[PDB]
Ligand binder design. Structure first.
Ligand code: HEM
Ligand code: HEM
Ligand SMILES: C[C@H](O)[C@H](O)[C@H]1CNc2nc(N)[nH]c(=O)c2N1
Ligand SMILES: C[C@H](O)[C@H](O)[C@H]1CNc2nc(N)[nH]c(=O)c2N1
Ligand SMILES: CC(=N)NCC[C@@H](F)C[C@H](N)C(=O)O
Ligand SMILES: CC(=N)NCC[C@@H](F)C[C@H](N)C(=O)O
Lengths: 413, 413
């Protein structure tokens, strides 16, 4: 039948039937395809499928060693095979997990920062058991990663999925995100993208401050239990106030953004095992904040105000006012982060670094999964070198997958 | 153990243990005692208890006739007995139901308007089956009762309780009531008494207008199904704008109140049967609006503003400013209703009418159940004659009982 297509700017959906007349459709520009998602479960991974995946991963791990260790490799293969037969699953050694988190990052097609793949701090929280313990592990992660502005890449691995009925899940999209409230006067306040989740927190008892930059609480689910809400300690959230190196009126906008880009809802998959809760972070690329968070019409939508304040021909598109504005906003973002000593990289230096990483990957392992659509910056496309680089997008393992929103697949009891 | 005691002005609860030292406690001033409540059920009324109640009621009904009808009485006794045996319950004839609604009103200890007991319009909605049908019946009731300001007493009887798992219930306390929102700025807006129910409606998808006089939607439950929300047609809600016959600044307060006092959450009990949904209405007594709705510290709390506007010594209680203010507010209420041709009676004329009704009841059936605590007006106590009248409070049958709030005893599926 029809293929559902969505416009993220207007939220409109369209149904494609015409593709049926195709000579041989391409789902390339789809944000969340099923091929990139790992849904929930009701019973453990069938032993028949888990086993071969595990063997493959142990072989990958032992193959990494410059100086091979055949005995340990064979021994581990034996132990893993036996463990899966005596328990149903298996536990990774801390070293294997570290390797897995890095390979998964290394295998993320949609990430430009992959040249940093080998530099990741891993926090092993596989022994965690309560929401409260998750919250502490997260506060620890936030604190280590922020590092007073000198951002460090890290990841916290919670307990792996067992029977799918007892998994750990962070209901947040990112560790730190701002609230979005649809004011009584019809207007939207704060981050429009977190409108629904904001209502969820409010439903769960959270206290709405109705500001434009209120950090939402951590909503944590442990051992398949109902989620518990935790306010993030303000002392842990490092923010940057926005100001332009020129244009002293920029600061009058009262804009700021958090310094920690930490993905919180992805699933790690390695050797057949799946970790439903494994928050990670790197540092920001200027355009994420300057172009998308501030300028997306569905986010902060500050373009017109900035253009108007710059005295541009705001009512005539051909004036390229939008181009001029967005660039000044990116300048503000980079300027502020740098002035306040918070790590950030511009979308040129990063593109160039990704290009170096790519050539490195090709000679190291003959390939690099890349999703051109996500890798090319939201501005200056053809100015960056990644735009002119042909790439192949494919899914390997270990890998970070999306997941269905937990509030959609969950029961009170 | 301890007896729980509550202060409705502060919401504070106290635990009474000292009563254990009593020589022989009185639960007289308790608002909702268990003796006045009829809770939910899980199975039909045991046949052993239902039968004798039914016979008692049929005897009461046939005893009412000035000219006795022995044959029909015996015949009806026989038919009812048989029907309960062949079905489990029984159906009242329309005439018996009318009689039941009036006797129950006649048996309401907490009502001063009982001199009007024989004048009640009964709408038979026992054949109703959906929320939508309930809503139409209610709109019909509201329209008939309002009568363009010439208020008429009426009651709509929905299907009786069967097994307790399929009953009709209006989740509203009154047909027409105003919303109460706890504003983002910490203040409460509108009717503080409907704060929780307002949140319920908002949870059920209702659209909050954040005003101080927004009519809440009808929340109807039919055949034990989940409740459905219905906005009351504005054309049906007759309101009165408040203004003082002198003091032209009174209207500047922007106060008003609905003209229809319609109790929506009480249960009718007759001959063993219980009707969980049977909204009824009479007309207003000035003090309900002027003293309690406007002046209760937990409702509109307009006393200080009115006192201040009257130029009274607002900061010195001994000045009796509160006394002076509340009386001017009652004057406003009566004045407005009368000017706008909407039925209402002052708390003097009504007290005197209740007293006439009481002497009537004593000679007619040797008694009148009266709850002195509710019958004496909230102002001018000893000035009204009911204050000096000793009365006995007792529960008869038919009777209107309270019920546990439905959101407390209900399941999605
Ligand atoms: C250290 C510097 C890093 C930079 C500058 C960087 C930058 C980026 C950028 C620009 C995106 C696009 C996000 C968006 O458009 O919403 C992204 C996505 C992503 N990055 Fe990186 N990243 C870094 C570190 C990491 C680390 C440490 C991991 C994993 C351990 C990682 C995993 C991913 C993944 C899986 C995505 C998924 C995008 C999605 O589908 O939502 N990144 N990164
Ligand atoms: C027609 C004029 C009527 C007047 C002026 C009148 C007046 C009153 C007043 C002043 C109260 C006190 C309410 C409060 O303080 O919250 C009351 C309560 C009550 N009235 Fe009447 N009423 C009238 C008609 C009716 C009718 C038609 C019925 C029944 C068919 C009725 C049943 C009751 C009951 C059961 C209460 C219960 C109070 C409670 O516990 O909430 N009233 N009435
Ligand atoms: C393609 C899809 O319509 C969506 O707009 C994509 C485009 N490329 C992107 N690239 C990145 N890095 N992040 C994004 O959110 C998107 N959005
Ligand atoms: C007695 C209990 O504390 C409560 O205040 C009672 C007092 N008498 C009343 N009388 C009427 N008519 N209505 C009421 O709400 C009350 N409230
Ligand atoms: C690690 C990084 N630079 N971004 C990853 C994706 C997410 F965490 C950031 C998001 N793009 C944001 O702008 O808030
Ligand atoms: C029927 C009557 N006069 N009052 C009954 C009780 C209730 F309907 C009215 C409430 N006292 C109010 O002021 O809104």
């Amino acid at each position: 039948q029809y293929v559902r297509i969505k416009n993220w700017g207007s939220g409109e959906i369209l149904h494609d039937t015409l593709h049926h007349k195709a000579t041989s459709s391409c789902l390339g520009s789809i944000m969340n395809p099923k091929s990139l998602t790992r849904g929930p479960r009701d019973k453990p991974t069938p032993l028949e499928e888990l086993l071969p995946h595990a063997i493959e991963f142990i072989n990958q791990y032992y193959g990494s060693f410059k100086e091979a260790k055949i005995e340990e490799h064979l021994a581990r293969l034996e132990a893993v095979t036996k463990e899966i037969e005596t328990t149903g699953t298996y536990q990774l050694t801390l070293d294997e997990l570290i390797f897995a988190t890095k390979m998964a990052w290394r295998n993320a097609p949609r990430c430009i920062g992959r040249i940093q793949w080998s530099n990741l701090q891993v926090f092993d929280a596989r022994n965690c058991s309560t929401a409260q313990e998750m919250f502490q592990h997260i506060c620890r992660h936030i604190l280590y990663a922020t590092n007073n502005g000198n951002i460090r890449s890290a990841i916290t691995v919670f307990p792996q999925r067992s029977d799918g009925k007892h998994d750990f899940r962070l209901w947040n999209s990112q560790l730190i995100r701002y609230a979005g409230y649809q004011m009584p006067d019809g207007t939207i306040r704060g981050d429009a993208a977190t409108l629904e989740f904001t209502q969820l927190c409010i439903d769960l008892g959270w206290k709405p401050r109705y500001g434009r930059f209120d950090v939402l609480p951590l909503v944590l689910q442990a051992d398949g239990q109902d989620p518990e809400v935790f306010e993030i300690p303000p002392d842990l959230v490092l923010e940057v106030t926005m100001e332009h190196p020129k244009y002293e009126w920029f600061q009058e906008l009262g804009l700021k953004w958090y310094a920690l880009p930490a993905v919180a809802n992805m699933l790690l998959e390695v050797g057949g095992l799946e970790f439903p809760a494994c928050p990670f972070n790197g540092w920001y690329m200027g355009t994420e904040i300057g172009v998308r968070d501030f300028c997306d019409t569905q986010r902060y939508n500050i373009l017109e105000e900035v253009g108007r304040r710059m005295g541009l021909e705001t009512h005539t598109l051909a004036s390229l006012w939008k181009d001029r504005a967005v660039t000044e906003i990116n300048v503000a973002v980079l300027h502020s982060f740098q002035k306040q000593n918070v790590t950030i990289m511009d979308h040129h230096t990063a593109s160039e670094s990704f290009m170096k990483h790519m050539q490195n990957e090709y000679r190291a392992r003959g390939g690099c999964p890349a999703d051109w659509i996500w890798l090319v910056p939201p501005v200056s496309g053809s100015i960056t070198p990644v735009f002119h680089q042909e790439m192949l997008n494919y899914v390997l393992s270990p890998f970070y997958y999306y997941q269905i929103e937990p509030w959609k697949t969950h029961i009170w009891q």
